[PDB]
Amino acid sequence: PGAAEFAALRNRWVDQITGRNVIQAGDPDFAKAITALNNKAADSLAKLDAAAGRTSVFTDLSLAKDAEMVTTYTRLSQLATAWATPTAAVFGDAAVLAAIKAGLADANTLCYNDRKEEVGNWWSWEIGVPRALADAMVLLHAELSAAERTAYCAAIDHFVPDPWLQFPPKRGKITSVGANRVDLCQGIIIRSLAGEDPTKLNHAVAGLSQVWQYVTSGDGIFRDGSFIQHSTTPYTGSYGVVLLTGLSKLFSLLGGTAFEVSDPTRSIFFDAVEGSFAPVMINGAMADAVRGRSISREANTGYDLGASAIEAILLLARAMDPATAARWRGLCAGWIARDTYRPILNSASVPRTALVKQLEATGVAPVAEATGHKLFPAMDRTMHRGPGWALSLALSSNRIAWYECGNGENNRGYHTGSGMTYFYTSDLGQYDDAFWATANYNRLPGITVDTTPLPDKVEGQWGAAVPADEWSGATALGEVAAVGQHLVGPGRTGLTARKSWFVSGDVTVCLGADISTASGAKVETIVDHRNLHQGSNTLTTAAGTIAGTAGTVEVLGDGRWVHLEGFGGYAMLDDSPLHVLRETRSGSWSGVNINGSATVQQRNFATLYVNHGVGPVAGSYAYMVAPGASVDLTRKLLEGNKYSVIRNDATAQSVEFKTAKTTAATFWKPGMAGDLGASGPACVVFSRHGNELSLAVSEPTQKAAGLTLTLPEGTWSSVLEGAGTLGTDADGRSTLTLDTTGLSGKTKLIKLKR
Ligand SMILES: CC(=O)N[C@@H]1[C@@H](O[C@@H]2O[C@H](C(=O)O)[C@@H](O[C@@H]3O[C@H](CO)[C@H](OS(=O)(=O)O)[C@H](O[C@@H]4OC(C(=O)O)=C[C@H](O)[C@H]4O)[C@H]3NC(C)=O)[C@H](O)[C@H]2O)[C@@H](OS(=O)(=O)O)[C@@H](CO)O[C@H]1O
């Protein structure tokens, strides 16, 4: 493994991270990318510490604070990037070069060297600095001496002697997993190019293989496409994207070389592009329900993370078979074209710009997001789509935490796992336009909530506690899904609620039952809490309009429906009062993240809710949401028994969709909902077509070995599709007995003939 091969690998990495070989002359998007590169470099140079015998490299960054030590090194690597990028203002500038070299030398002497013990966050010492210092060594290889390489390699190896492990010796070292394994292996691989160390490079490449093996618990990719990091938090949209980015860059770097990734099981990672990442991408944004504590970050948004996933997918597509390459390019062209709110080229790097330009040059057409249901039972998440909308549900259970907070981020997010209903629509900024700085964290859309105030960081950091609930889970057949959550409230209030969602191709029916608490406070259920930006969007009712005055809550008259201009319709399925509030809310990103700006953002909201009162005894609700419905269509929702409630109590919750001729149900106890029965916890959807009955079924606790259904629509004597055993009960009804051992909440599809 020789000098020529190492020089070629370093030159490829510099090509990848600068775009120096792919800048198109006179292209306006390249010029904008260089301007952004120039402005960041100039900002850093303006902050250089010029003092004799300096103790920092930048006047605004202390080397005694571990996060500011990381930013010292990322500024130095950005400066080296600019120095290596043709047409940048500092390209080849010897004075700027000397300042980068002196910054790397003094940061090494003063702080980050092979005699230093870690202080503070392990991630700073083992991932933040190594990736940036390794990039700077490679960018500056022709300029650093052999003695400088020896010093900086020794510092990296001191903190990361083995990238299969993490934490300083005093803590006890553990296996690194998922995004952390990828980031540690990346820093050692790039450091092995600077120091020409084939032994360390080979071991780091071999370390990538663990991250795409299927798991059934802990962190990683599950067979249903879920991705978990930190044991208990759904995490495809942030840690999953870190993993996707780092593998795309390392696979591209090493391809065709002596160090190429050759493990055939990497097919599992490729299958995750459509199995894991695509269903939670919504018009260019990663869904908030799968990005954990990053919702609290003003400048690490669902669109920032979706744009990074698009860049990685485009980079990986270059190596794939023709059909797969074109499918991934079509998905990306669609997420790019539909996103007029944060266009991907605004503030894009040179490499990102080149990949987006290459995609446009293929002429590959944009692929629409498919209607229908994508369920992720391993991480208590579901996605549902129809024309103009995508619903993301955020549940929690004895497997999945209420929320992750940590490092001063998302400390207020404790209700985000209480049955949230995110309706994404053509309002592309709904959840991005200062929503997380201004929203009422006690009235998030869809939740049931005990109004007892909870402290920041209630239930602990890092998802350490989970609700001891009965089950959360889901199933779907064709166009209809059934989703259930036994909500146990955070903060030991004793709040309990049975929340179910029955989701068709257009409307979502929301049923709640068995609601009580021990706290003595009122309990609410939030029909919506919806960002109006600076708008005065009209709320129309049967009688006229409601909540025309900001700050004055009103109760809906008798028609039972309300339409929100720019959104769609809501309607009540019982005779409970609906409270409607137009409100103006203010807050700063500093109020939800220690790193957030102090700038105050002010936003208008529409807030619709039911009040279960103090001391509810088996409190309940029933309502529906029709995203995109007109006033006329909203007025008609409650006519003709289109959405026919069957049962809504502590035993079962069920609705029939008249038009779709399909019935959906959740079961909490053994019992009957209309003419369907279950022997235990179940999600069921069924539809008869003439002499054939179709069923989807899940066993949502993930722990029962069997489940028996009492079948609707008459008697059934054979099985056409699927597995299960037919039987007959005491009352002459047909039964279906399923073996559910080890099914992990997955759906079984069955078809019976009369
Ligand atoms: C303090 C401590 O010991 N806590 C551990 C906890 O470790 C923490 O969790 C993560 C981790 O990597 O596991 C680490 O998260 C990453 O933090 C950095 C800054 O430190 C970035 O956050 S940001 O600066 O606020 O944006 C990073 O964000 C991502 O960065 C990048 C990138 O650099 O490539 C790209 C993405 O766009 C962006 O989202 C952030 N990662 C994410 C995805 O948020 C913390 O720094 C680290 O303290 C866990 O440790 S673990 O190893 O067991 O996982 C935790 C597990 O329960 O245990 C705590 O004790």
Ligand code: NA
């Ligand atoms: Na956790």
